[PDB]
Amino acid sequence: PYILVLYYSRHGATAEMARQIARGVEQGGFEARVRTVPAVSTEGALYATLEDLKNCAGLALGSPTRFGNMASPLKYFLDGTSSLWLTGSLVGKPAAVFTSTASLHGGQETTQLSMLLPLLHHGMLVLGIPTPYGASHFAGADGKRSLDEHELTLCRALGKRLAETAGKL
Amino acid sequence: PYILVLYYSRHGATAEMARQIARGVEQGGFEARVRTVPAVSTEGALYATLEDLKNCAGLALGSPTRFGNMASPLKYFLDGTSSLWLTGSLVGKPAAVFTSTASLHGGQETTQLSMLLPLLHHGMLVLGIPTPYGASHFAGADGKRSLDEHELTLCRALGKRLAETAGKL
Amino acid sequence: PYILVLYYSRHGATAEMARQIARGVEQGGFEARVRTVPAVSTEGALYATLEDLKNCAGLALGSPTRFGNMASPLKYFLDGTSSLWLTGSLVGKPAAVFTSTASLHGGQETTQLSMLLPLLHHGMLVLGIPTPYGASHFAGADGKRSLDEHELTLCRALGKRLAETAGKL
Amino acid sequence: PYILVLYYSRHGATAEMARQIARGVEQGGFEARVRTVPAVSTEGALYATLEDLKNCAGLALGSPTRFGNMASPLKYFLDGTSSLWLTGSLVGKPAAVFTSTASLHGGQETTQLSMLLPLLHHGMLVLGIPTPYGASHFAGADGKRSLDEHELTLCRALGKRLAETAGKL
Numbered sequence: 001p002y003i004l005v006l007y008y009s010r011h012g013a014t015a016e017m018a019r020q021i022a023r024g025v026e027q028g029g030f031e032a033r034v035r036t037v038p039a040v041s042t043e044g045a046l047y048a049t050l051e052d053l054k055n056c057a058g059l060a061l062g063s064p065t066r067f068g069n070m071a072s073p074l075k076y077f078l079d080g081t082s083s084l085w086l087t088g089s090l091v092g093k094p095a096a097v098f099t100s101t102a103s104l105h106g107g108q109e110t111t112q113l114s115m116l117l118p119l120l121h122h123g124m125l126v127l128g129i130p131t132p133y134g135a136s137h138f139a140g141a142d143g144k145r146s147l148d149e150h151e152l153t154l155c156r157a158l159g160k161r162l163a164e165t166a167g168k169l
Numbered sequence: 170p171y172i173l174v175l176y177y178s179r180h181g182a183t184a185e186m187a188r189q190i191a192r193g194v195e196q197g198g199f200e201a202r203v204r205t206v207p208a209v210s211t212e213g214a215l216y217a218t219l220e221d222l223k224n225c226a227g228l229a230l231g232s233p234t235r236f237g238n239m240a241s242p243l244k245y246f247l248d249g250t251s252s253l254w255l256t257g258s259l260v261g262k263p264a265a266v267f268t269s270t271a272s273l274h275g276g277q278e279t280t281q282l283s284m285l286l287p288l289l290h291h292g293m294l295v296l297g298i299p300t301p302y303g304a305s306h307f308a309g310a311d312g313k314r315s316l317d318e319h320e321l322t323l324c325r326a327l328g329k330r331l332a333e334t335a336g337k338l
Numbered sequence: 339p340y341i342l343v344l345y346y347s348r349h350g351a352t353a354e355m356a357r358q359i360a361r362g363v364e365q366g367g368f369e370a371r372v373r374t375v376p377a378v379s380t381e382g383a384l385y386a387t388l389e390d391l392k393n394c395a396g397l398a399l400g401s402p403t404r405f406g407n408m409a410s411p412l413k414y415f416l417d418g419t420s421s422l423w424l425t426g427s428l429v430g431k432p433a434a435v436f437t438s439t440a441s442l443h444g445g446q447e448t449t450q451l452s453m454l455l456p457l458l459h460h461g462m463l464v465l466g467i468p469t470p471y472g473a474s475h476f477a478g479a480d481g482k483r484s485l486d487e488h489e490l491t492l493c494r495a496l497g498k499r500l501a502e503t504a505g506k507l
Numbered sequence: 508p509y510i511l512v513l514y515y516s517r518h519g520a521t522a523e524m525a526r527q528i529a530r531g532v533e534q535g536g537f538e539a540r541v542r543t544v545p546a547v548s549t550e551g552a553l554y555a556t557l558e559d560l561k562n563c564a565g566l567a568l569g570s571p572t573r574f575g576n577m578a579s580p581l582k583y584f585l586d587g588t589s590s591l592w593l594t595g596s597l598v599g600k601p602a603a604v605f606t607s608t609a610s611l612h613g614g615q616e617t618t619q620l621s622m623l624l625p626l627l628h629h630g631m632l633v634l635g636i637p638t639p640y641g642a643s644h645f646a647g648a649d650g651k652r653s654l655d656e657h658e659l660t661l662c663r664a665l666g667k668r669l670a671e672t673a674g675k676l
Contacts (some may be wrong), residue, residue, distance in 0.1 A: 037549075038549040039549065040547040040548060040549055040579065041547060041548070041583075042545040042546065042547055042580075066585075066586050067585055067586070067592070067624070067625035067628045067629070068470075068625050068627070068628050069577070069582060069621060069624060069625060071582075071586065072547065072579045072580075072583040073549075073579075075573070075576060075577075075578075075582050076547060076548075076549070076579040078574055079573050079574070079578065079579050081574075085574070088299055094294070105467070105469060105470050106446075106447050106471075106474075107447070107469075107470060107624075107628065108447075109447040109448050110447050110471075113282075113448060113451075114575070114624065117574070117575030117617050117618075117621065118574035118575050118576060120295075120297045120301055120302055120575070121574045121575050121614065123296075123297065123298075123301075125263070125294050125295070125296045125334065126289075126294070126295050126296075127292075127294045127295075129292075129443070130260045131443060131444035131445075132292075132406075132443050132444055132445060133289055133444075133448075136444075165338075168337070168338050169334075169337050169338065206380075207380040208380065209378040209379060209380055209410065209414060210378060210379070210414075211376040211377065211378055211411075211414070235413070235416075235417050236416055236417070236419075236423070236455070236456035236459045236460070237452070237455030237456050237458070237459050238408070238413060238452060238455060238456060239413075240417065241378065241410045241411075241413040241417050242410075244404070244407060244408075244413050245378060245379075245380070245410040247404075248405070248410050274636070274639050275615075275640075275643075276455075276638075276639060277613075277616075278613050278614070278616040278617050279455050279616050279617065279620060279640075282617060283406070283407060283452045283455065286405070286406030286407060286445075286448050286449075287405035287407060289406070290405045290406050290445065291405070298612070300614075301575075301612050301613055301614060302613075302617075305613075426637055429637045432632070451620075458633075458639055458640055461634075461635065461636075463601070463632050463633070463634045464627075464633050464634075465630075465633075466627045466630065467630075468595055468598045468630030470627055470628050470630075471627055503676075507672075507675050507676065
C-alpha cells in the first residue's frame with residue numbers, strides 16, 4: 001500500500017521535490033516509499049530495486065531535465081525492467097512525473113513528456129496537474145534556487161492526487 | 170454512465186474504429202455514446218455537444234492523422250471547450266486515443282501523442298494499450314483498406330479498458 | 339526570395355510576434371511575407387495562399403497554444419496542403435515555430451513541438467533558438483500582456499536565423 | 508569534413524543501420540566517421556569522444572528504442588556534453604536520427620522524436636526522410652531480423668541527405 005517516488009538527483013533539486021511529493025502521497029491516504037538510483041559510468045535516499053517497482057500501488061518518476069530527456073542513471077534503472085513490462089506489470093497502476101531544470105530557455109514540458117512515454121509503454125495510467133504534465137522546478141544556473149511555496153504546493157498536490165487515484169483504483 | 174467516443178472521419182476509417190471501441194465500452198460495463206463533429210470551412214453519427222463532454226464518465230478521442238496532428242474539425246470542437254477546462258471538468262475522468270493513417274512512412278504515434286496533450290490539459294487520466302499510446306489503423310493510400318481481426322481486437326480492448334477504468338474510478 | 343511568416347492570431351499576441359520575426363527576416367537578408375488565415379466555422383494581415391507556401395525560401399509558423407496544439411484555423415489551412423506534400427515541396431527549405439499562451443501552468447514547448455511535426459512531414463529542416471524549439475510569449479490571462487525587450491529580441495533572432503539559413507542553403 | 512554517425516547498439520541492429528547511413532554520407536560528398544559508446548553500469552566500432560562531436564560537420568544519432576527513449580549508454584555520453592552546449596557548438600550543424608525496435612506494438616517515432624529534442628537544445632538543424640522523423644528498423648522479438656532492401660535504401664538516403672545539407676551549409 002505504497003506509492004513509489006522514484007527519482008534521480010545531481011545537485012539535490014529533484015530530491016527535495018521527491019520528499020514533498022511523498023508528503024502529498026501521505027496526505028492522500030498512502031505510504032510514500034521514496035527511492036533513488038546509483039550513478040552510472042563506463043569506468044541520500046535508499047536505492048530502488050526491481051521489487052520496489054513490482055509492488056507499488058502507483059509511481060511518481062523524477063529527474064533533472066538533461067537535454068530534453070531524463071537523466072541517464074534513471075534511464076539505466078528503467079532499461080533494467082524488461083521483466084516487469086514483459087509480464088505486464090505496472091499495468092493499471094497510476095503514475096506521474098516531475099522535473100527540475102537549471103535553465104531559463106526551457107525543456108521541462110518536453111522532458112516530462114518524454115518520461116510519460118515509458119509509463120504508457122509499461123501500460124500505466126498517467127495523470128498530471130489539473131506545467132500540466134507534471135510538477136516542475138526552476139533551479140537557476142547555480143543549481144541553487146529552492147522551492148517556492150507555489151512549487152511545494154504543486155508537488156504535494158500531485159503526490160496527493162496520485163495516491164488518491166491509486167486509492168480510487 | 171456512458172463513455173463518449175468522440176471522433177472525426179474523412180473517408181470513414183476512423184468511423185469504423187469508433188464503432189468497435191463502442192463495442193469494447195459495452196463489453197466493459199458502460200454505454201457507448203458515439204459522436205462526431207461537423208466539417209469546418211472559411212467559406213454518419215450524430216454531432217457532439219459540449220454537454221456530451223461535460224457528462225461522460227470517460228472519453229475516447231479519434232481522428233485521422235493529418236500531418237502529425239489531429240484533424241482540424243475535431244480541433245475546432247475542442248477549441249470550443251474553454252468553459253469545461255476553466256471550471257475544471259473532464260478532470261479525474263479516464264481517456265484514450267485512436268487514429269487512422271493513409272500512409273506507409275508513419276505519423277500515428279506522434280498524432281496519438283499530440284492528442285493526449287489536451288486531455289492532460291483538461292486534467293484527464295490517460296491510458297493506452299498495455300501502438301502503445303492508442304489504437305491505430307493503416308488505411309492504405311486508397312483510404313480503402315479495412316480493419317483486420319487484429320485492429321478490431323485492439324479497438325474493443327481499448328474501449329473495454331477505458332470503460333473498466335471509469336468503472337474502477 | 340522571401341520567408342513566409344505564416345500565423346494565426348485570436349487576440350493579436352501571435353500577430354505582433356509575427357511582425358518582429360519579419361524584422362528578423364529582413365535583418366537576415368530576406369523579404370518577409372507576413373500572412374494569416376481566416377477563421378473557420380461549421381456555421382489584420384493578408385490571407386495566405388497555397389502559392390505563398392509553394393514559393394517561399396523558408397517558413398515561420400505561428401499560433402496561440404490551444405490545449406497543447408496549434409489553433410484550428412491554422413490547422414485547417416495546412417490540412418489543405420496535400421498537393422504540396424505529395425509533389426514533395428517545402429522539402430529542403432528551413433522552418434521555425436512560434437507561439438503565444440495566456441497561461442501560467444504551461445503548454446508552449448509541447449505546442450511548438452506539435453507544430454514541428456508537420457514541417458518534418460513536409461520534409462523541412464527545422465531550427466530553433468540556440469524556449470529552445472522556438473520563440474514563445476506569455477500573454478497573461480487577460481490576453482493583454484505585451485512583448486518584452488527580451489521576447490522581441492528572440493523573435494527577430496529566430497527570424498534572422500531562419501533567413502540566414504535559407505541564405506546559406 | 509566528416510559526418511559523425513553516433514550510435515549505441517545492444518544486439519547489433521542499430522550498428523548495421525549506422526554503416527549504411529555512413530555509405531549514404533559518402534555518396535553525399537562527405538567522410539563518415541562511425542562511432543559508438545561504451546556500456547554503462549553502477550557496478551565493434553571505435554568509441555566516440557567529445558572532440559569527435561566538436562569537429563563534425565553534422566551528426567546522425569542512433570539507438571535502439573528503449574521504452575520510448577534512447578538507450579542509457581548513449582544518453583550518458585550526451586549528458587557529458589555540457590561544455591559543447593555551453594560554448595554553443597553543434598549550433599548550425601545538421602542532424603538526423605535513427606532507431607531500431609524489437610517490437611510490433613510501436614515506439615520508434617516517439618523515440619526518434621525524443622532524440623531530436625536534445626539536438627534542438629544543442630541548436631542543430633534537424634532533418635528527416637521526405638518514419639518521417641528518421642530511419643527506422645523492426646528487429647523482431649528475436650532481435651534477429653535483418654535490414655530490407657527498403658530499410659537499407661532509407662538509411663543511405665538519410666545519410667546522403669544529411670551530408671548534402673552539411674555541404675549546402
